[PDB]
Subunit: 240 residues, 6 copies
């Protein structure tokens, strides 16, 4: 049968999302997070297969939902979460590449700000440079959580690209020269939306591939990296 | 268990896609298309929930797969289809809004070229204007199929935006002044990738909403529009 | 003596242009077309030497006029034709270069859309990518006319440059990679003006030079190519 | 019969142009200049109707040729003149509009530099601002010639637009605020080409229309303005 | 007499700067800081009046130097400090305006990242968006120092403009919508230079003026704000 | 004690500046100019160490003040001079590099217009190319003064960069190809401000360094070049 749609992309009823949300690109990973780390969990969205869930982590309300790939996709889901669902804090949890000579596969990267080759932020600031900037309380909560768990982290800039299959000569060299630590596809679209709503966002990623040396984490290594990163993010939500 | 991954985003084995592929944003709609219009069908991808299927339509090999929302998402899937899976023709089948005073909800729009607010095409052509242009044989096959089915069509330009939740003053007025017939989020990313691979692409969409008058198709009207559009696209594949 | 000027650039009286117009860059070629293919012909413009003529082709009203070289020049003449002279359809008939490895000197190219290094289309669409797109009925009429005449054609993208004497490294390689078939100087300015007026435009060109291999048509070869192209265009006007 | 073509656009033999050339948009005006002010005159180009002539003014070699409308057109002709024909000095002689509150119809404007909405100069200077700048000796020769003839002049910036039929809100107000004295379509393309060849250029125009007040010179007033301007330019060539 | 110049703009000998440097725009304020907060102090630069000093704060080496007004000025001085003088950490200490409805005159703002209307960061990252991002350890040291001193702070984005005397409609509204807390002229040029050198930077400012409400701190209020901010910065250097 | 501030950056009382002002980057050089060439001199500004002075040169009122380094710095000081202090004419007197093969160290360069990599002029002219253009009477006064003093000059374009420490491949080659004679950091910001106020500006510089050949003037050679340039500028003020 037909269900009421609070947004064109989300079947959750208003109020069905907690004020704090973790988001990852893969909806199947959102389900894994819910099934393994949330209690009191219920599925709240199924539209487009973009699974979302709401429950608790250590008693505190927490939701987790997929965001798909790229800035336009996360922008739809995050705009709706902040606007319609009255979410206050989103932490993107993801994987990334790196070009930095001192960042290695399996490293955990906490993002302070994100560059991009998208136009979406120029369009928000009269064509000027608008830094997609993580909220400091969120960054700090991630840093402090990792410290308490004795998990080392890299803290610094990400670069969110519209083009996974890059053909762009000189890009990697410039990213490395300025010590961008993470290359991914979404965080630069998230932070300005949080700003618009007077809300908060951050991002944490694990390095799956070194773009320069060609090193790549195995499936088991990616699972271990994910377990470290997700525990950092979950513990951080208790501070937010 | 773990399966071999021919790409990071697709579990299909090389050869598991037909040379002709229909793509829509919603993977659940890809499943509906497969279940109702394909024979000899098998599911060939499940990664990220982005369902894809291969079978036949009236005996001719045909695949259907979801592409997600926005240019970066379709770019990943389409690049892989043309490159790794050796696809020759992709037709995007979707829904759209319109601003044009003479285009109405439920109309079928066949896209000849697509504008965009993305930077991805400037990056391919030394910063210049690169029109995302549908292949003429594909456009013609869609037009002729609709004529044979006695289904009226609008033929003309689309506009692919990175931002579903537009805040941009004057955009709708400019799109209307120049008679853009469809507003959507992906086609401008598809056509240049087809060009790169010496392959073909097109797009057909049904109008779900009039952005100016605020008219909106009901669920049943959207189903009827989808049935008209999908039959046009399927019959067109027989010519391609 | 002094004559009334309906525009600053055209001495034709309102009504002196047919609803369908062929335009070429060289006004002396416009005169050749009129003298050899039109009946009932009269010269209707002489301002700036930009000869224009109105008569009939196989009984149907048809005009032919020069447009000069480059986007700003065609923009003046075409804006006036659509606005003041109430023209409905303009077909640009021209010559072009090519970089595509499978397009050859003397080939006839029918343009579906045109890229450019001009800013004129960004200025029309809030700085975004606005594809200069030929009207589908015009493209189809050209394609079908060539088929009936048994003249092979290439159908695809043109690139309209402001700079005949290019010094731009990498441009030809990018145009070839994305299979632009024609390099010329005007069509990208024509199509958006037709859009503004709710009117129609297209373009057909013959390849005079291969920019990569350095092949070049002789004067006699250019005359033969012109005869093929002009017959296609004239027959197409009967369908428009 | 067929004649040798030193360029694709000019039938003049190498050496047939003097080192100093006046250019105006209208080839019929080039003929008027030759017929009324040059001695020893011969027509040296007829291609595309773009008449050009070479003779003497007060015994000194001088050529005059049309350049057509817009930056791409003047760029073709001027590039060829400096490169193939070894011209040293080009003075553009034209008409213009004005928005400046203290510039009036029939005023003579001597151009020191020209702004533009074209991309051609960004493409020459790595995307940066490259001022299209008149040569100082040329500007000074025009100023001093007008002084000797007791003809008042305005000296300052022009703006060269690609779009005669402007739809651009706020442009006139900005041009007026910064005291641009002349609005025309070509000079910004001429000066950088002179620079490339280590050569010289300038521009002088008469105001035919006040864009703000709507005043417009009659045909007779335009003839008188032209006579003043052309005498200034001709006398200036004796100093160059 | 003439002294050796290690850079064109700085008479300090290599080694004469500490590894940690505070910089403010006004060199006379650099002198005030040195005279009132440093021990073991010596003047190390006088070129262009851009006073710089080196001494200790609570025993730890610390320098303080003026940077002048605007991105190009700070870029010269900071590039030299990181490159020639082997500085590791620069904290910019300044004043700012605000547009944010919840930021007030006399507030202390700690900058996490800075937007800009300059092109300098696009030029470093292939024309893309490169966020000028403060180092997290520096931000944290400033935050923790203010907490220990019981001084409230605002933490968030700055905007560095090239134009003190703005005429730009809509800028303040956009800055407020996205909750930029500080409007100043230099920090966006500092952070990318620190990145290039593998070094660290941050910025702290006091609000002298509310751009919207027109409130303005008196000289005495500015002195009190400066005393709070400088103590935070000095204590932070002990952690860096 | 506290003094009244007519601007945030200048302690001069309204009326304390002459209508004609020389400006140089280094305030200590402004003091040298005042002390050695002005009579009736008084210091009128000390804020930020940006020394300014007013007196007479050969009996005519003249001021001299530092402007600091870069477009944003000169923009502050010059905007205030034209607006608050009612200055009519500013001549920037400076040093520069050159890339031109025929310009040599110690040459005096008189600037007719200035290119830039700044965005400040695009922001004034709706994103278009706005040439920073010197006033012709000022240029002419400088040229004629140098002639009377028998000092050779180069007259032509400058390029004002935001980045002293360039890392930009191909920039020098392009500047040389188009015969830019002076590379400096401020003049492109000055001329448009003079335009806004209906006032006049110019620039004269001496070549301290050849960027290509690596030649560099010694301190004594720079003093001699400065003496030549300053005498030209001072004599020019008598004509303005
Ligand atoms: O975690 C999934 C990962 O998938 C893709 O590579 C992109 O969408 C990344 O931005 C994202 O982090
Ligand atoms: O059909 C689904 C529809 O969904 C969204 O609105 C966008 O992704 C469109 O581009 C697409 O057509
Ligand atoms: O046909 C003439 C031909 O001339 C020039 O090369 C350009 O104006 C082309 O765009 C045009 O096609
Ligand atoms: O003189 C002719 C005049 O014609 C048009 O208006 C444009 O080409 C101008 O730039 C030119 O000055
Ligand atoms: O502190 C001085 C203050 O001066 C000016 O307003 C600008 O240079 C600011 O960026 C700076 O903060
Ligand atoms: O004269 C001083 C000189 O200093 C620096 O190099 C820049 O500010 C130049 O623009 C200026 O000319």
């Amino acid at each position: 049968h037909h269900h009421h749609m609070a947004t064109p992309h989300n079947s959750a009823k208003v109020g069905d999302f907690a004020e704090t949300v973790l988001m990852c690109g893969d909806p199947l990973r959102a389900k894994l997070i819910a099934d393994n780390y949330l209690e009191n969990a219920k599925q709240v969205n199924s539209v487009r297969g973009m699974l979302g869930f709401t429950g608790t982590y250590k008693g505190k309300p927490l939701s987790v939902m997929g965001h798909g790939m790229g800035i336009p996709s996360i922008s739809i889901y995050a705009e709706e979460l902040y606007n319609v669902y009255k979410v206050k804090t989103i932490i993107r949890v993801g994987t990334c590449g790196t070009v930095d000579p001192n960042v290695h596969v399996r490293d955990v990267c906490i993002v302070t700000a994100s560059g991009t080759d998208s136009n979406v932020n120029r369009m928000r600031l009269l064509g000027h440079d608008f830094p997609a900037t993580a909220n400091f309380e969120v960054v700090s909560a991630l840093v402090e959580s990792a410290k308490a768990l004795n998990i080392p982290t890299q803290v610094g800039k990400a670069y969110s690209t519209d083009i996974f299959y890059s053909k762009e000569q000189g890009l990697n060299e410039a990213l490395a020269q300025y010590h961008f630590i993470a290359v991914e596809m979404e965080s630069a679209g998230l932070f300005p939306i949080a700003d618009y709503y007077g809300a908060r966002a951050g991002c944490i990623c694990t390095v799956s591939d070194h773009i320069i040396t060609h090193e790549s984490a195995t499936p088991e290594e990616r699972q271990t990296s994910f377990q470290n990163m997700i525990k950092i993010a979950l513990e951080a939500t208790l501070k937010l």
